[PDB]
Amino acid sequence: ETRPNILVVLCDDLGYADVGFNGSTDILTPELDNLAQNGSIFTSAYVAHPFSGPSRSAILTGRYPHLTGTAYNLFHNSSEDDKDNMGVPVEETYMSKVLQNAGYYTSAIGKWHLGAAPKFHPNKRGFDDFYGFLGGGHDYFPSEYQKTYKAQKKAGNPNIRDYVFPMEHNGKPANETEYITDGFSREAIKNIKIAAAKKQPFFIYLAYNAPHVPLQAKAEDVAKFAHIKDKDRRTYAAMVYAVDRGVGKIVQTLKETKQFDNTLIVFLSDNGGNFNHGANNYPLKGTKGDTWEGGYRVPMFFHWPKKIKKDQRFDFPVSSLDLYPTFTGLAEAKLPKGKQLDGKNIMDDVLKNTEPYKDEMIYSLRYREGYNDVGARMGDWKITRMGNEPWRLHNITQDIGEKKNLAGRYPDRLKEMIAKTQEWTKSFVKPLWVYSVKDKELWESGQMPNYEATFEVDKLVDSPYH
Amino acid sequence: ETRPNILVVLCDDLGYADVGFNGSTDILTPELDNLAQNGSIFTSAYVAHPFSGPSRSAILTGRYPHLTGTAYNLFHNSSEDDKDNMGVPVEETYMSKVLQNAGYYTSAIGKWHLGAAPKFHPNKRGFDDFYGFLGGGHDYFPSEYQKTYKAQKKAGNPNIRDYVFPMEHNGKPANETEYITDGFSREAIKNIKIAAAKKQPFFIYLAYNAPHVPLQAKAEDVAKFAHIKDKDRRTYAAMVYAVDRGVGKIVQTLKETKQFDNTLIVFLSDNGGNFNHGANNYPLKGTKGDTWEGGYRVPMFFHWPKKIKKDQRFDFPVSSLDLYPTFTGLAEAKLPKGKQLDGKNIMDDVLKNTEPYKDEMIYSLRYREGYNDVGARMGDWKITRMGNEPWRLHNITQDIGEKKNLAGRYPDRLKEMIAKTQEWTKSFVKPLWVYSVKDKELWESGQMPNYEATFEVDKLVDSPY
Ligand SMILES: O=S(=O)(O)O[C@@H]1[C@H](O[C@H]2O[C@@H]3CO[C@@H]([C@H]3O[C@@H]3O[C@H](CO)[C@H](O)[C@H](O[C@H]4O[C@@H]5CO[C@@H]([C@H]5O)[C@H]4OS(=O)(=O)O)[C@H]3O)[C@H]2OS(=O)(=O)O)[C@@H](O)[C@H](O)O[C@@H]1CO
Ligand SMILES: O=S(=O)(O)O[C@@H]1[C@H](O[C@H]2O[C@@H]3CO[C@@H]([C@H]3O[C@@H]3O[C@H](CO)[C@H](O)[C@H](O[C@H]4O[C@@H]5CO[C@@H]([C@H]5O)[C@H]4OS(=O)(=O)O)[C@H]3O)[C@H]2OS(=O)(=O)O)[C@@H](O)[C@H](O)O[C@@H]1CO
Ligand SMILES: [Br-]
Ligand SMILES: [Br-]
Ligand SMILES: [Br-]
Ligand SMILES: [Br-]
Ligand SMILES: [Br-]
Ligand SMILES: [Br-]
Ligand SMILES: [Ca+2]
Ligand SMILES: [Ca+2]
Ligand SMILES: [Cl-]
Ligand SMILES: [Cl-]
Ligand SMILES: [Cl-]
Ligand SMILES: [Cl-]
Ligand SMILES: [Cl-]
Ligand SMILES: [Cl-]
Ligand SMILES: [Cl-]
Ligand SMILES: [Cl-]
Ligand SMILES: [Cl-]
Numbered sequence: 001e002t003r004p005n006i007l008v009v010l011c012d013d014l015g016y017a018d019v020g021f022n023g024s025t026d027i028l029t030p031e032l033d034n035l036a037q038n039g040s041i042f043t044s045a046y047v048a049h050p051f052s053g054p055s056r057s058a059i060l061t062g063r064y065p066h067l068t069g070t071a072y073n074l075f076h077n078s079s080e081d082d083k084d085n086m087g088v089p090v091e092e093t094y095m096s097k098v099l100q101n102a103g104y105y106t107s108a109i110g111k112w113h114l115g116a117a118p119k120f121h122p123n124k125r126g127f128d129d130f131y132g133f134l135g136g137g138h139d140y141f142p143s144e145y146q147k148t149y150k151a152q153k154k155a156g157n158p159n160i161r162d163y164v165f166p167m168e169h170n171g172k173p174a175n176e177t178e179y180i181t182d183g184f185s186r187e188a189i190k191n192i193k194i195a196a197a198k199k200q201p202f203f204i205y206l207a208y209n210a211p212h213v214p215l216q217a218k219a220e221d222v223a224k225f226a227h228i229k230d231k232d233r234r235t236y237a238a239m240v241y242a243v244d245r246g247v248g249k250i251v252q253t254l255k256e257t258k259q260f261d262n263t264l265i266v267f268l269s270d271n272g273g274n275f276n277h278g279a280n281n282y283p284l285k286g287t288k289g290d291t292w293e294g295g296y297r298v299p300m301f302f303h304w305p306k307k308i309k310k311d312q313r314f315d316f317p318v319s320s321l322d323l324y325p326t327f328t329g330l331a332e333a334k335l336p337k338g339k340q341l342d343g344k345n346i347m348d349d350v351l352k353n354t355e356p357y358k359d360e361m362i363y364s365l366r367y368r369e370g371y372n373d374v375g376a377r378m379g380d381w382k383i384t385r386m387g388n389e390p391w392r393l394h395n396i397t398q399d400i401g402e403k404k405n406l407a408g409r410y411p412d413r414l415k416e417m418i419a420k421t422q423e424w425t426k427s428f429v430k431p432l433w434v435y436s437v438k439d440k441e442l443w444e445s446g447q448m449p450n451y452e453a454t455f456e457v458d459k460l461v462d463s464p465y466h
Numbered sequence: 467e468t469r470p471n472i473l474v475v476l477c478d479d480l481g482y483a484d485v486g487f488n489g490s491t492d493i494l495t496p497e498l499d500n501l502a503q504n505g506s507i508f509t510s511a512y513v514a515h516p517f518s519g520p521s522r523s524a525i526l527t528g529r530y531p532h533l534t535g536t537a538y539n540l541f542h543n544s545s546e547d548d549k550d551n552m553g554v555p556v557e558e559t560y561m562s563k564v565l566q567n568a569g570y571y572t573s574a575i576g577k578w579h580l581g582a583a584p585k586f587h588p589n590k591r592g593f594d595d596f597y598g599f600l601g602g603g604h605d606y607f608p609s610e611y612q613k614t615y616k617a618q619k620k621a622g623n624p625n626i627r628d629y630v631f632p633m634e635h636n637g638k639p640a641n642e643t644e645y646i647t648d649g650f651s652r653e654a655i656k657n658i659k660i661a662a663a664k665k666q667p668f669f670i671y672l673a674y675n676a677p678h679v680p681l682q683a684k685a686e687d688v689a690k691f692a693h694i695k696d697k698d699r700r701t702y703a704a705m706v707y708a709v710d711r712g713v714g715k716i717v718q719t720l721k722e723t724k725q726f727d728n729t730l731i732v733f734l735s736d737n738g739g740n741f742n743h744g745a746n747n748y749p750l751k752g753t754k755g756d757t758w759e760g761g762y763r764v765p766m767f768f769h770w771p772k773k774i775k776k777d778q779r780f781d782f783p784v785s786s787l788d789l790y791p792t793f794t795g796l797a798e799a800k801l802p803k804g805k806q807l808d809g810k811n812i813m814d815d816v817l818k819n820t821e822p823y824k825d826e827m828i829y830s831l832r833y834r835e836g837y838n839d840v841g842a843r844m845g846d847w848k849i850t851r852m853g854n855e856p857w858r859l860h861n862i863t864q865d866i867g868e869k870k871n872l873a874g875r876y877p878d879r880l881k882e883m884i885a886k887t888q889e890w891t892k893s894f895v896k897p898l899w900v901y902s903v904k905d906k907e908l909w910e911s912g913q914m915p916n917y918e919a920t921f922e923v924d925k926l927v928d929s930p931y
Contacts, residue, residue, distance in 0.1 A: 075929040086931070232869075276869040369854040369926065370836055387853050388835040390902075403698075403742040436856075437925040459903035460835065463541040465552070 004304060005195065005202045005263040006099075006327050007188075007250070010059070011243060012052060012111060012137075012212035013288055014299065015273020016281040018240055022299040023282065026228055027237045031248035032301075035265060039303035040312040040350055046362050046377075047271055047320045048342075050295030051288055052136060053113050055270045055320065056207070060094040060114065060125070062324030062341040066365060066425070068092050069432035072439070073113075076136060077162050080116045086433060087115015090124075093336045095324040096203060097126025102333035105200040107191040108132065110184045110207035116162075123170060127205070129194075131169045131187040135162040138209055140216040140239075142176045142183075163214075179218050181210050181239070185246025189253045196257035203327070207270075208246075211239040213277050218242060236278025261305045264330065268320065269298040285402045291364045291375035291386060292402055302350060316355040317377055319362050322346045361420055365454075367431075369438050370447055372454045376421040383417045390460040391418065407461075415457060422455040470770065471661065471668045471729040472565075472793050473654075473716070476525070477709060478518060478577060478603075478678035479754055480765065481739020482747040484706055488765040489748065492694050493703040497714035498767075501731060505769035506778035506816055512828050512843070513737055513786045514808075516761030517754055518602060519579050521736045521786065522673070526560040526580065526591070528790030528807040532831060532891070534558050535898035538905070539579070542601060543628050546582045552899060553581015556590075559802045561790040562669060563592025568799035571666040573657040574598065576650045576673035582628075589636055593671070595660075597635045597653040601628040604675055606682040606705075608642045608649075629680075645684050647676050647705070651712025655719045662723040667797070673736075674712075677705040679743050684708060702744025727771045730796065734766040734786065751868045757830045757841035757852055758868055768816060782821040783828050783843055788812045827886055831920075833897075835904055836913060838920045842887040849883045856926040857884065873927075881923060888921040 017023045021036035048058035053073040054065035065071040070088050079086040100106045108127040112134045114120055122130035139145040145164040152160045167174035176183045188206050195202035217238035224241060228234040247267075254260035272295045273279020274288040286292030300318075302308055321343025328335060329345040349356040359378065366373040371388035380397040393407040393414040407414045428449075434440050442448035482488060485495045487502035514524030519539040520531035531537040536554050545552040566572045574593040578600045580586060588596035605611040611630040618626045633640035642649045654672050661668035683704035690707055694700040713733075720726035738761045739745025740754040752758030766784075768774055787809025794801060795811040815822040823844070830841040837854040846863040859873040859880040873880045894915075900906050908914040 075931060079931065084931075276867075371854070388837070401742075433931065435929070437928045437930050438922065440930040441925070456904065459907065462903045464900070464903045464906040465541060465545065465550075466543070 001199070001201060002262070003201045003331055004306070005204075005259055006104075006330065007202075007204045007263055007265045008059075008206060008323070009243075009247060009265065009267040010056075010205070010207045011240075011267075011269045012207070012209045013271060013274050013277075013279060014211055014240065014269035015275070015279030016284050016294065016297065016299060018211070018236075018273060018280055019299050021301065024280075026225075026233070027240050028224065029240060029244040031244045031251060032267060035247070035251065035267070035303040036301040038305065038310045039265075039301050039308045040314045042300040042302070042314045042318055044315060044317040045268060045298055045300035045320075046317060046364070047268070047296045047298055048364070049271070050290055050364060050366055051271050052111075052212075055296075056111075056113050057088050058342075059270075059320050059323060060096065060205075061088065061092045062095060062321055062339075062343055063092065064321070064342050064363070066428040067340075067342070069429050071365075071367060072431055072433060072435045073136065074115070074433065075435065078116055078135070080118075082117045082119045084117065087117055087120030089432070090119050093339055094125045095327055096122075096205065098328050098333050098335065099203045099331050100126040100128065102328075102331045103200065104203045104331060105191075105195045105198055106203045106205075107188075108205045108207070109187050109191070111137070111209045112207070121171070129170060129191060131167070131174060132184065132207070133162070133165065133167045133209075135165070137163055137212055137214075138165075138167070138180060139163050139214060140180050140210075142178070142180070179242065181208060181242040181246060184208055185243075185249055188246070188250050192250065192253050192257060192259065196259055201331070203331075208243050210243050211236050211278065213274075215239065215278055221245075232278040233280075264302060264304040266300070266302055266323065268300040271296055272298065283400050286386075289366060291366055291373040291384060293375075293382075293396070293400065295366070296364050296375070307351060312353075314350055314353065316349070317357050317362050318346055319343050319357075322356070361417075361424070363421060363424055365425065367439070367448065369436075370442055372449060372451070374421060374454060376417055378417060378420075381413060381417065383414060383421065385454065391457055393417070418455050418457060422451065425449075425451045425454075467665070467667065468728075469667045469797055470772070471670075471725055472570075472796065473668070473670045473729055473731045474525075474672060474789070475709075475713060475731065475733040476522075476671070476673045477706075477733075477735045478673070478675045479737060479740050479743075479745060480677055480706065480735035481741070481745030482750050482760065482763065482765060484677070484702075484739060484746055485765050487767065490746075492691075492699070493706050494690060495706060495710040497710045497717060498733060501713070501717065501733065501769040502767040504771065504776045505731075505767050505774045506780045508766040508768070508784055509779055509781045510783040511734060511764055511766035511786075512783060512830075513734070513762045513764055514830070515737070516756055516830060516832055517737050518577075518678075521762075522577075522579050523554050524808075525736075525786050525789060526562065526671075527554060527558045528561060528787055528809055529558065530787070530808050530829065532894040533806075533808070535895050537831075537833060538897050538899060538901045539602065540581070540899065541901065543625075544582055544601070546584075548583045548585045550583065553583055553586030555898070556585050559805055560591045561793055562588075562671065564794050564799045564801065565669045565797050566592040566594065568794075568797045569666065570669045570797060571657075571661040571664055572669045572671075573654075573660075574671045574673065575653050575657070577602070577604070577675045578673070587637070595636060595657055597633070597640060598650065598673065599628070599631065599633045599675075601631075603629050603678055603680075604631075604633070604646060605629050605680060606646050606676075608644070608646070645708065647674060647708040647712060650674055651715055654712070654716050658716065658719050658723060658725065662725055668725075669793070669797075674709050676709050677702050677744065679740075681705065681744055687711075696744075698744040699746075730768060730770040732766070732768055732789065735764040737762055738764065749866050752852075755832060757832055757839040757850060759841075759848075759862070759866065761832070762830050762841070773813075773817065778816075780816055780819070782815070783823050784812055785809050785823075785828050788822070827883075827890070829887060829890055831891065833905070833915065835902075836908055838915060838917070840887060840920060842883055844883060844886075847879060847883065849880060849887065851920065857923055859883070884921050884923060888917065891915075891917040891920075
């Protein structure tokens, strides 16, 4: 057996400038930085959607959420009955199931957000082990949330928020006793040791909910950030530091079990930081949920000592959609018949420092209340529509903050990129669920999605009097 | 004659953190800072719209642009024919004309943006003198724009941008020879001296186009800002510094003419900074054009040595709409019959440190392509809708950056403020012009303005399941 172990370390709402290797000056991430410095830092890494549910759907299915009907978040406490189909389609085979069928020991830890009904459960979607929670977020201290859950259960509360539900281990009570970031790190260590004892390659999907709200941190970690005056930034920094501590213990475990050299560690965020709740996306414009770069360009590194050189910087754009074909290629796994994928097996490009998306697009489209936000990048160029304002064209390599609209200078390039992006939307399916009552009314009237209006150009800038 | 002179120094797209007295750490504005420190700094000053045309219309008419039909910008090179009525309604009397009729010597300098046809001209709107340009912006170096203008005319260009048109002085060519910020400062000094010789109180509307794009600065000013590493912010800083130099020369002139003590100087920006083009609105969220605070909360001071004490900070919210009734009050000027005003005479509130908008609203509504952005503030509380997202309630005193939505914590307060804001929109008129072809299509179909949809609340947050 020479196939590598694969560890995905996925943070939740981690800001672009909030790890040291991607520019942080106030948040300390020495363990993540050491891995990044000993592998490949991706300076133009994108997720397939600027917020969690659709982004995580894309990671595990390998498809844009607009093709699977999962481009809106599931609501909190979404239906746990199979009959309601509130989850990613079961026919869309996850890479975990592909790796499991190829003989990998598979483990999911932390946040799911891909369906709370039994047919959507991690154990039915290719994970031998699951430890975590099914919804979109969770309170961080068991001594707090277990007391709240128990009191509200006894009081007969019918609206108990899923943020205080007991976590689970393979459908049984987890009985967590630690700050849950530490608990997730503990379970990752355990599953690494299980794989080593089995002498089986592992795939671990470690989906920390940190630094997603609520901003809750251990006093021991907060103490290391007294140099930060803003309380939210200080708490957020401590939350990221807790992840870094866990990564350090995971690395030590990989070394002890002699799995370190032939493990591919992939670290990223599921979307941009929310700059209302502690995050910093510098030098990108915008925030979680935007199609500015700040919404869906994320930190990422690959660390794999057997193959990936130290101190590498990979500057060509890549997508979290690339993880599915890259991982199944490394696992020598056969895809299910008819499986469709929107990403690329990029490992050879990473090893050769070549451009996987040369002359091809990486996209985002985010549904708003009556219009769509869009981003589309090819090479050095990006088109952006935000707030239904006029279309922008940016040289994103020379103008990473999207400050200088070049649409008037290069109209032909703008319209070529518009045409390809519009063609992409012709492949979309209807959402299986929307998020608000407003959404439902808009889709039912045809006011959404109205892709045709999204790709208007001239009428947004022309005067009716000239 | 006891009435004070009034000098309005209005910058164009000046960011919230881009003058020293309002928190700048890198842009140097010693003359403006000295005036602010010797008067009253307004820490919650608002303009009536988050971009220039409608904001400037509101300043001179004293009414929200939604009541005068002027809530969109005029397009570049807008019609110069009276028949097309591309300008602020002539019936909506400007405070310049009221002051002129009250015996003030009146002068407008720099940017207009209120109509380029003759009936909209400053000289027809209460200004004895006008030196500047009629449209929305201008290139800064005459040696550059006069060369481009003359060449494009010879090239038979039918679409010459008004940014390079020759400036004017009372309808005649201005023949400007200086960096135009310096030229505007020079003309302000001249008009101060004219009023001193006339022994007439002056009203001077000094509408610098700085620091609005294009980012163009003098080498002598750029040399002061080597500590600014970002290239656009360095140029932008030098553009603000040139305004500061001119203010210093204006102050020296007021002292020499013995007008300084009884001049009210009001300094402000017409809207928030554009953070794509050098500006910084810290600690506010957002940028020019938004209904986040960063779009329309601006730096402002009042300086008037005879009455306003030094080292004052005025923390209650105020509006640029207050300038019209405050100035006409100081001028003891009678308003025209039927004139309506949306602001307040706030001078006694400023001197007494009392709250002019107690239990009342300061508003913004900005039209977008198919929806409306809104902001509304009463006391410590603000409601915001941006991008047609769910409504937000902020304690703007505790949460100036609009980071923490309290809509779920205080739903009754949110809905009370929304109800009052919706009632305000019931008074609106139709825009006399819109900006884009898309705007025209949306208004003609009835998709705009749809104020009813703007004030939906519950359906934006409730799940259908
Ligand atoms: O009254 S409540 O606010 O509901 O009660 C509060 C606590 O619940 C809240 O906790 C977080 C703050 O608001 C919600 C939580 O954040 C949300 O988490 C989601 C995942 O669980 C998701 O990440 C949300 O972002 C999305 O929001 C919608 C849907 O997709 C888009 C957007 O359209 C995402 O954002 S963006 O556009 O990409 O930026 C995120 O905002 C809320 O919980 S929940 O979401 O209602 O479940 C509650 O736990 C506590 O007890 O009381 C709090 C009181 O304020
Ligand atoms: O082809 S161009 O790019 O137009 O040519 C350029 C030069 O003209 C430009 O110069 C500035 C950059 O874009 C325009 C100028 O900025 C604009 O100035 C306006 C005032 O003159 C106004 O401030 C504009 O903001 C508004 O834009 C619309 C209308 O109201 C809102 C928004 O909906 C305002 O913005 S916001 O929402 O509040 O933020 C501002 O963007 C452009 O000039 S013009 O506007 O076309 O007249 C040109 O002079 C030179 O020759 O070539 C340049 C090449 O790029
Ligand atoms: Br599956
Ligand atoms: Br638990
Ligand atoms: Br090893
Ligand atoms: Br008038
Ligand atoms: Br000139
Ligand atoms: Br004096
Ligand atoms: Ca997330
Ligand atoms: Ca302006
Ligand atoms: Cl938020
Ligand atoms: Cl926001
Ligand atoms: Cl082109
Ligand atoms: Cl479909
Ligand atoms: Cl069009
Ligand atoms: Cl811009
Ligand atoms: Cl912007
Ligand atoms: Cl209340
Ligand atoms: Cl509603």
